[PDB]
Amino acid sequence: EVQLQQSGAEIVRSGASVKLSCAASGFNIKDYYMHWVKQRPEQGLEWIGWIDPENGDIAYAPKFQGKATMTADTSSNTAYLQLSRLTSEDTAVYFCNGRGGMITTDFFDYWGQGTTLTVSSAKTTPPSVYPLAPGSAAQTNSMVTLGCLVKGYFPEPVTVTWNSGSLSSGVHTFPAVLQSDLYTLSSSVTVPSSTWPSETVTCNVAHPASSTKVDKKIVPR
Amino acid sequence: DVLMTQTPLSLPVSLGDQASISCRSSQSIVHSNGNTYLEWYLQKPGQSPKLLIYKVSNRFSGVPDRFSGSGSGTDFTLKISRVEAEDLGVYYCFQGSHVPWTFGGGTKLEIKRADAAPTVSIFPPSSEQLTSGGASVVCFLNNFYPKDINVKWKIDGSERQNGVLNSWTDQDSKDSTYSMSSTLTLTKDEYERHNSYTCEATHKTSTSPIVKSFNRNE
């Protein structure tokens, strides 16, 4: 089974450079063209360029002339994308795509899983976990929404559960957003008014990078 | 560059519906060799793009026969004969005829459901955060449909934008709704100089803004 395996998530400060890898197994990159594609958070696909690993021929999109450098190492069956003079605009997922044979045989087209680049000068920082309890009381047989705000951490991921995974219905956990080099995430849970505060509701936050675990009970104000 | 123009931006469908997605190239994409290198891709959440169609109308190996493509030299159409649940995601056209190769801006294929009002909940800063010198006000806007929504914050009646951080979820697999979180972050110092904090949402389901508010001093 063919496989294009991309390197792991990268975190690099602005003004530096990063080199991402795309390693083939089950086929030879000399026999195909490699393409790279960028995708910023909540945006569409953007083409970067192609490289012929056999000949060393390269075509770049004009925008990435200067920014990107595509290379390949046929002996390790690996293609590389270097991104230089980094800024927050380079924060994105980068995909490699091996393709060829469109003329001479059955078209071959395989994609890597993507590599995330986060441009930030932040050091590993544990989260602050804040309980969100309602400002006013609930009416009879109504729904009450509780929340958990997870602020000031780096890098991703943090995890959030409710009652150690026993409260799963009525939960919404929102993707983290980076601003000023640190992440914020939030999670809500909506439960019948008869169940809170009569029963305990706790948000559970883990941050593997900092070895942090925080369990915060949601208590009425 | 050859610019690829997709339409529509969003395509709400029921399962079993026919779906048509179009792409117009700004210039001809018939290569001098005679081939028209027009491709269609589907990208599902958290996944790499998957090739569906190449050279306008050639179905890629493994692609279901419900997918078909046609086109002239500048106008192209992807058709799904009867949409299946696995087809939901974002579709892109792509041309490889002229460097730089270029993608269309994408079309979101989503499930049409009945209109659903946002469930809006506002939260003052926690005592724990205030102890740390911060003051975030959080507003959840949950389980709404359609996805088009606009959130505005007011402090003592005046619009506030500095310090607002929004996040949201894609269409829910069980109920086909969307949700959103909006967090206004202030210093504790600034929080304590104002009284009323308001989250306002505009959505199809209400003719006026949907409002939740509190006053700091209770």
Ligand SMILES: OCCOCCOCCOCCOCCOCCOCCOCCOCCOCCOCCOCCOCCO
């Ligand atoms: O009437 C029905 C409808 O009602 C719905 C609402 O129900 C509300 C009540 O909830 C019911 C469901 O929940 C039942 C269980 O309730 C548990 C409440 O527990 C509160 C106390 O929890 C304190 C924290 O407990 C966990 C502490 O763990 C510490 C060790 O952490 C281990 C690591 O964390 C896991 C991830 O790590 C893996 C990587 O290392």
Ligand SMILES: [Cl-]
């Ligand atoms: Cl933060």
Ligand SMILES: [Cl-]
């Ligand atoms: Cl837990």
Ligand SMILES: [Cl-]
């Ligand atoms: Cl049907």
Ligand SMILES: [Cl-]
């Ligand atoms: Cl593009």
Ligand SMILES: [Cl-]
């Ligand atoms: Cl529903």
Ligand code: NA
């Ligand atoms: Na709702």
